[PDB]
């Protein structure tokens, strides 16, 4: 069995670029490289981006700490 927290620890180690699905907001998702995280699933993301699914537009953010409140879903992207 894989525990969800560990999957993240794996994401962290891998420096796979990550795409986050936000809570009750579908038109925007967030992207970045997990540098570290805490017990509340708060994430530190590097070279992060806002992704507008409707506008096909990207907003450049750099160093981000995203509160975990917003996390719906965590996926990896090849880019």
């Amino acid at each position: 069995m894989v525990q969800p927290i560990n999957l993240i620890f794996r994401y962290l180690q891998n420096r796979s670029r990550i795409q986050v699905w936000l809570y009750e907001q579908v038109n925007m998702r967030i992207e970045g490289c997990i540098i570290g995280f805490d017990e509340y699933m708060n994430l530190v993301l590097d070279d992060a981006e806002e992704i507008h699914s409707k506008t096909k537009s990207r907003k450049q953010l750099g160093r981000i700490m995203l509160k975990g409140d917003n996390i719906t879903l965590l996926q990896s992207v090849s880019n």
Partner: peptide, 11 residues
């Protein structure tokens, strides 16, 4: 297809 993922129980 999105591969292997984490879903937060909250949502």
């Amino acid at each position: 297809n999105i591969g292997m993922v984490v879903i937060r129980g909250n949502s």
